[PDB]
Amino acid sequence: DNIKVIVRCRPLNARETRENALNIIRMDEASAQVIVDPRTFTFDAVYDQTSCNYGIFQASFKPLIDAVLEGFNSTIFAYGQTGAGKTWTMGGNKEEPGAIPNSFKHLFDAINSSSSNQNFLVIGSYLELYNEEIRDLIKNNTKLPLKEDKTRGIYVDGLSMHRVTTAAELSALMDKGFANRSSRSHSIFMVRIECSEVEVIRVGKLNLVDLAGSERKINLSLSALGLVISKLVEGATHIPYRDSKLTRLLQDSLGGNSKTLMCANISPASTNYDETMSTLRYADRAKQIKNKPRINEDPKDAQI
Ligand SMILES: Nc1ncnc2c1ncn2[C@@H]1O[C@H](COP(=O)(O)OP(=O)(O)O)[C@@H](O)[C@H]1O
Ligand SMILES: [Mg+2]
Known part of the structure; x- marks a missing residue:
């Protein structure tokens, strides 16, 4: 079904408070409404x-x-x-x-x-995308290329994969990646979960994305993301996933085989009215996207 969309408004920060900015955001959580x-x-x-x-x-x-x-x-x-x-x-x-x-x-x-x-x-796995260049945040290897095939889909060639057995081990990978990690860059922590159930193997890929700032090449991926969303909502014949590394990496999450949720973060400050309006209108459009998620059974790529 449709991509899920939520909005999170943070408290006024120090800068905004000291500059006497006013809170222009009201919410009715019972009706899932945000009022500017x-x-x-x-x-x-x-x-x-x-x-x-x-x-x-x-x-x-x-x-x-x-x-x-x-x-x-x-x-x-x-x-x-x-x-x-x-x-x-x-x-x-x-x-x-x-x-x-x-x-x-x-x-x-x-x-x-x-x-x-x-x-x-x-x-x-953990990567950073900046200036259309992919960096492995765990090994700190740069300019990793994208590759794609039928038995694996889109992937980063050379990106280090780490087998983990506890949440502490996963958090340690994140910690190490963070140490190497920004306002213009995108980060994606990926978790591949394969399950062998008895005879039947299923595989799910989790993408945890922290996008580059949306305010106001370096912005090619951000621009492509907006175009892809627009094309999807407009029912265009061709969806320009290929326009950027970000949209190729997340092609399945955008109108494809995946369940997706977008969290639109906004500031409550009067000073940010224009960007907040942009973020909300952007999110409003994204919720119209319909995905076609399916259970991924017995994939020819299963590593288990
Ligand atoms: N919901 C929130 N509650 C309290 N502080 C927040 C909240 N969201 C952001 N902040 C604070 O404001 C700053 C900016 O948030 P950050 O998430 O780094 O922004 P960005 O959207 O650029 O990633 C940080 O110093 C963070 O601690
Ligand atoms: Mg950030």
């Missing part, structure tokens, strides 16, 4: 300044992680202007983990609760 002081938008869920990372995970992100555990491909991407809260939402901190570490914990808590009829193989 007024222009009103309705999404799948809205989160105001009182929302915490854990709550957003349980209500909006968790279902996407459960989908991968079931054999579906899932993608969660954070979109919004620099400073809006994409990284805080996707990564958070040790005290208040974001979507990525929360997903790691949930994935393994689920696997540990599985019966003897299921055996799992979890593989992690």
Whole structure:
């Protein structure tokens, strides 16, 4: 079905507070509405300044992680202007983990609760896309090329893959990647979950995306993402996935074989009215995208 879309408004920050900016954002979480002081938008869920990372995970992100555990491909991407809260939402901190570490914990808590009829193989990868160049954030290898075939789909040739058996191991990979990692770059932490159940192998690919800032080549991928979304919503004959590395990497999450959720991060500051309006209108369009997710069984690429 359609791509899920949520909006998260953070609290006013120090800069905004000291410059006497006013909060122009109102939300009605019961009706999933965001109001810009007024222009009103309705999404799948809205989160105001009182929302915490854990709550957003349980209500909006968790279902996407459960989908991968079931054999579906899932993608969660954070979109919004620099400073809006994409990284805080996707990564958070040790005290208040974001979507990525929360997903790691949930994935393994689920696997540990599985019966003897299921055996799992979890593989992690982490990349940064900047100036149309792909960097392996774990090995810090640069300019990795994209390759694509029938028995693997789109992939980064040379990107290091890491087998992990605990959430702590996955978090350690993220920690190492972060140490090497920005406002103009995109990051994607990938988790491949293969499950052998008894005889039947299923594989789900999870993409945790933290996009480059949307405010106001370096921006080729961001521009291509917008075009791809527009073409999809308009029912165009040709979807320009090939226009950028980002849209090729996420081709399945955009109108393809995947369950996808977009988190549109916004600032509540009056000073950011224009960018907030842009982000919301962008998100409003994205929710019209329809995907065709399917369970991926017995793939000729299964590494288990
Ligand atoms: N929901 C939130 N609650 C509290 N602080 C937040 C929130 N979202 C962002 N911040 C803070 O504001 C700053 C910018 O957030 P960040 O996520 O890094 O922005 P970006 O969208 O550029 O990735 C950080 O210092 C972060 O701690
Ligand atoms: Mg960031």
